[PDB]
mmCIF file of C-alpha atoms in Angstrom:
data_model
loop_
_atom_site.group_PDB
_atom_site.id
_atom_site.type_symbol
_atom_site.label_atom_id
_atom_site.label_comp_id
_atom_site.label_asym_id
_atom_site.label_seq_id
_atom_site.Cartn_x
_atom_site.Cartn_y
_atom_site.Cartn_z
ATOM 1 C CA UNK A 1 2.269 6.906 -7.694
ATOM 2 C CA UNK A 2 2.426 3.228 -7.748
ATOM 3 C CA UNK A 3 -0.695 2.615 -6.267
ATOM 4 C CA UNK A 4 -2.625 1.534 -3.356
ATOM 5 C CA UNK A 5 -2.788 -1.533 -0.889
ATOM 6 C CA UNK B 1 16.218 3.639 -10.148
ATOM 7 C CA UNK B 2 12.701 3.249 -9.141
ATOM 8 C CA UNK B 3 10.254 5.515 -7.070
ATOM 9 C CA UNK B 4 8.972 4.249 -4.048
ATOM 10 C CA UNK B 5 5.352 4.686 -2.451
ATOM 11 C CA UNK B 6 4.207 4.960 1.115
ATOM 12 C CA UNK B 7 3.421 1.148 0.620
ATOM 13 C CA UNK B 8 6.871 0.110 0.193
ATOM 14 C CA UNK B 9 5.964 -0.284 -3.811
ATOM 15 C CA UNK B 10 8.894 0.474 -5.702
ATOM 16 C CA UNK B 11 7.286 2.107 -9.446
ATOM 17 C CA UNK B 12 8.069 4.427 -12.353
ATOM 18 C CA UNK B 13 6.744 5.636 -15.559
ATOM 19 C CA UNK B 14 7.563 3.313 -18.850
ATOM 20 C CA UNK B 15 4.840 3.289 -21.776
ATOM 21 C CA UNK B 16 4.823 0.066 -23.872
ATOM 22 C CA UNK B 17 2.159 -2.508 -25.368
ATOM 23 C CA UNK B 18 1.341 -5.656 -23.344
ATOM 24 C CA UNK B 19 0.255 -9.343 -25.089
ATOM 25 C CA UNK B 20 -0.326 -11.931 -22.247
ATOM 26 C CA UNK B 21 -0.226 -15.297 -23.594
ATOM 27 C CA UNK B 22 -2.201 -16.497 -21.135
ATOM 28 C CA UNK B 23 -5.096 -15.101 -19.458
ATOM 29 C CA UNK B 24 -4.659 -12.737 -16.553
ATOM 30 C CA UNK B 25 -6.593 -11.750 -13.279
ATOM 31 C CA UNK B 26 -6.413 -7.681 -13.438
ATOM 32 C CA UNK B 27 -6.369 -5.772 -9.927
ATOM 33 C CA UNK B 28 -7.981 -2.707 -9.048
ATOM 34 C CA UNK B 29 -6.517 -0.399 -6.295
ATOM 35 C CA UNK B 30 -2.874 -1.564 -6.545
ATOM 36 C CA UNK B 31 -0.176 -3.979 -7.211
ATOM 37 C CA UNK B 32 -1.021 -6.883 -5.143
ATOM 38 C CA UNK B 33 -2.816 -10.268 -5.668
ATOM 39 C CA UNK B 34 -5.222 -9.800 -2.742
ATOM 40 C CA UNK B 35 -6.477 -6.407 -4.872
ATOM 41 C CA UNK B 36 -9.879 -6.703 -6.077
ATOM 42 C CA UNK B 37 -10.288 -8.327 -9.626
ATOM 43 C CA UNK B 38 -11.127 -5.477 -11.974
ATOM 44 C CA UNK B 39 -11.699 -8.166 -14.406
ATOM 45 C CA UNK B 40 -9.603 -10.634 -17.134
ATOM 46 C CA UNK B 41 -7.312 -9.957 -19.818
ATOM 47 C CA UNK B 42 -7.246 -12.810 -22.196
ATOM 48 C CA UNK B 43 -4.650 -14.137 -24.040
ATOM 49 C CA UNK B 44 -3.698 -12.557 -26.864
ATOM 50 C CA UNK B 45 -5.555 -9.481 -25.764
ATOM 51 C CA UNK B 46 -3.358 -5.995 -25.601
ATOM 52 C CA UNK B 47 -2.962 -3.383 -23.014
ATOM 53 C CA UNK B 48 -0.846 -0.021 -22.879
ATOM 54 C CA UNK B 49 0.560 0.384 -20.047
ATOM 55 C CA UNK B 50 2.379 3.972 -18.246
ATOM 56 C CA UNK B 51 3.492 2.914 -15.153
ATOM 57 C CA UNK B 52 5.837 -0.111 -14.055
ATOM 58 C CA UNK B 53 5.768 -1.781 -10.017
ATOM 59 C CA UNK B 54 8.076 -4.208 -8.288
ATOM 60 C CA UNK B 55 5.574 -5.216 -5.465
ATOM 61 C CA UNK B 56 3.916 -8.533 -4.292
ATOM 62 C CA UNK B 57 6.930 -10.985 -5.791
ATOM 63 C CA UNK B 58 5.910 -9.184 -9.243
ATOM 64 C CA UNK B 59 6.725 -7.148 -11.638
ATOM 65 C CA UNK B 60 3.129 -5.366 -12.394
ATOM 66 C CA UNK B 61 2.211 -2.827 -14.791
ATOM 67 C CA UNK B 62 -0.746 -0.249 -14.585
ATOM 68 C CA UNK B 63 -2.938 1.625 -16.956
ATOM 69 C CA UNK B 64 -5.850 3.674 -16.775
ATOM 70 C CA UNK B 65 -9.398 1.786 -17.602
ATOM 71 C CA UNK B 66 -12.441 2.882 -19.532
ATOM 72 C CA UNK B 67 -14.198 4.288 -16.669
ATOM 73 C CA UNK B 68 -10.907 6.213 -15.837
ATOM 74 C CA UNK B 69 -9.905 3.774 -13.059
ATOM 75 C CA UNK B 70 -6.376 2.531 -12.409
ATOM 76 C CA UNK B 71 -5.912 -1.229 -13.272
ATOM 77 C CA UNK B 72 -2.660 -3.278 -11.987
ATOM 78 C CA UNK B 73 -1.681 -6.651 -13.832
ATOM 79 C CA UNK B 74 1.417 -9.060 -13.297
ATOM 80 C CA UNK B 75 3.206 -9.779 -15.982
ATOM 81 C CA UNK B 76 6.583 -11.986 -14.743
ATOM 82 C CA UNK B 77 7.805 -12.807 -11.084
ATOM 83 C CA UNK B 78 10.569 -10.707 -9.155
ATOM 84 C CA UNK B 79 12.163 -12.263 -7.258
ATOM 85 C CA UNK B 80 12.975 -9.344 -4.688
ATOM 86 C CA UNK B 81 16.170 -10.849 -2.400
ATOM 87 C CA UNK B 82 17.990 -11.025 -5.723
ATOM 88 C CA UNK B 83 16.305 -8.884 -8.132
ATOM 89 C CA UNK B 84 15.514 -11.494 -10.417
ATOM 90 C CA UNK B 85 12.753 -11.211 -13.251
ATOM 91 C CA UNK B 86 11.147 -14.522 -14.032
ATOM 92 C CA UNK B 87 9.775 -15.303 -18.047
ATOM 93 C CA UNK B 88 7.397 -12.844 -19.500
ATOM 94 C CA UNK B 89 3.880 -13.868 -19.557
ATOM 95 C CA UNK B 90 3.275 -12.601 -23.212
ATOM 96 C CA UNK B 91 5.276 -10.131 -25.117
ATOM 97 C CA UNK B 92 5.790 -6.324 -24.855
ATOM 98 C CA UNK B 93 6.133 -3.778 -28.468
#
């Protein structure tokens, strides 16, 4: 979770 | 507590209503400013939101879009070497 980058 | 990703993102689930009171650049991919702009939230426009993020000097939340994409937008400062929020940039219900 949290996301990419 | 918070989660933390293979990015270093530290995240967890909270569900609430967000109000900007100012408009917003939204991010696609993830919690950073040099993210892709998935488009603007105006002021006074309202998202709901599932997942929280300390990342990028922000505190960002995320919610799924109408075309079932994830969308990241920053909605105070954190100040990370003292794990300070800055002033809200709209209000949460």
């Amino acid at each position: 979770g949290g996301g990419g980058g | 507590g918070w989660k933390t990703n293979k990015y270093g993102t530290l995240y967890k689930s909270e569900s609430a209503s967000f109000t900007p009171n100012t408009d917003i650049i939204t991010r696609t991919t993830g919690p950073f400013r040099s993210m892709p702009q998935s488009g603007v939230l105006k002021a006074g426009q309202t998202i709901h939101y599932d997942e929280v993020m300390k990342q990028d000097g922000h505190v960002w939340v995320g919610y799924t879009g109408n075309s079932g994409q994830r969308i990241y937008l920053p909605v105070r400062t954190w100040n990370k070497s003292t794990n300070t929020l800055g002033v809200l940039w709209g209000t949460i219900k």
